[PDB]
Design a protein around this ligand. Structure first.
Ligand SMILES: [Mg+2]
Lengths: 247, 255
């Protein structure tokens, strides 16, 4: 079904899933990481060519409830600028209302972290009842969406009253600045903070979701992508790649 | 697209597999014979999506595997392929053999293969050690997912394990045989965790291995997959699946 086809793949840098070199490379060779290794193997086995297309707005994607419009990689997919989103794309109901997901490749949860040993914070909602710590989530990323759609609207308060963060670099910078709880995703934080010995978890992880690829509704490629991703998991390839790429 | 589930009557494949499904064999009729985590999910789905349903068990009482001699399926998988059912509503493990013939819903639970053992004295650290000894017997249940995963593993020593193990008919027979002693039973983590909670003389053989999911089974080209997938994702995101596991899975331990 994919032999000879060309796939336009939405992606962005998100270590260790994807690394994007901004110079010293051309085309697909600018990309590396766990997801890139998956795409390369898919392309070899299924016989397609591909390219990566980043959203101009550099966002993952969320639905703005004021305008009822999407942004980020989700929007590029809906606009038919891409055929599939190849990244750690978290599963949530808002996205599911607009796009499909492939078979998942990894489980993930929401994790909150803070700099400084011995934090008094036991659970993130406690942030609302104090002013020693600031906190935040990154705009147009999955954790913001999950917290805003949580049944307990105190999670919407956390988002609305938090610091808006531009991207992962900005968030980690702010975290490393102290007195700041950053709420994001376990696997991304596990990598990326491996060497920050003075950064600690706040509470336990919460919400259970998956990382998958994103597909447009009625994609003719979903069946094959799903089958091959399942085989990757069953054969141990996903675990081998995580061991290869995660610090 | 246009087709939804309102007013449809679904035939759902299932069998008893505690704590996912319990089937009463007397003193009940129809859907009232069924209870468990999966039943609670189906009830909620039926209310939200507007379908009625019944459960249909395969006569062979198998989950389903592909016979490489005949190229035919059995169990719930076969019933689905034969249009006796519309969806398999159970802890249906994801594997590539099944995926060649059917689709899966969005998953509801992670699971792994787990090996357990009863016996005093020397014990085992990893299942392949079984091949180089004769103190312990061992087995997997025929036409169930662990057998399929071991038979398709690229290390054919796992096929030896299956081929040289004792034949087990179903979960009751396997647990019976395990409790008889000097036996390694290789099955699925969540199933064993629930059903062996009180067996203080049953221990692990190594760590869990192979990661897969439990999902519902759907025929290829089902007009209902999108809706079922969306609703199952919402169940997970809302914490409903976790609440049901806490409701149904065994707690405490006399051990
Ligand atoms: Mg999973």
């Amino acid at each position: 079904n994919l032999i000879g086809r060309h796939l336009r793949l939405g992606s962005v840098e998100e270590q260790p899933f994807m690394f994007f070199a901004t110079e010293g490379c051309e085309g697909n060779d600018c990309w590396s990481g766990m997801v890139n290794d998956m795409v390369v193997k898919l392309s070899e086995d299924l016989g397609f060519t591909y390219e990566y297309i980043q959203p101009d707005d550099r966002k993952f994607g969320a639905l703005n409830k004021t305008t009822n419009e999407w942004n980020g990689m989700i929007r590029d997919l809906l606009d038919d600028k891409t055929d599939m989103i190849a990244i750690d794309l978290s599963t949530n109901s808002a996205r599911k209302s607009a796009i499909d997901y492939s078979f998942p490749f990894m489980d993930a949860g929401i994790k909150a972290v803070v700099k400084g040993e011995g934090t008094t914070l036991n659970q993130v909602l406690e942030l609302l009842d104090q002013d020693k710590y600031k906190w935040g989530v990154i705009g147009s990323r999955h954790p913001e969406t999950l917290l805003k759609t949580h049944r307990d609207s105190r999670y919407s308060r956390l988002v609305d009253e938090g610091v808006e963060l531009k991207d992962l670099n900005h968030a980690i910078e702010t975290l490393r600045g102290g007195l700041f709880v950053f709420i994001d995703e376990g696997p991304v934080l596990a990598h990326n903070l491996i060497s920050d010995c003075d950064v600690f978890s706040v509470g336990e992880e919460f919400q259970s979701f998956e990382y998958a690829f994103g597909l447009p509704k009625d994609s003719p490629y979903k069946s094959l992508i799903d089958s091959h991703l399942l085989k990757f998991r069953e054969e141990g390839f996903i675990d081998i790649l995580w061991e290869k790429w995660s610090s």
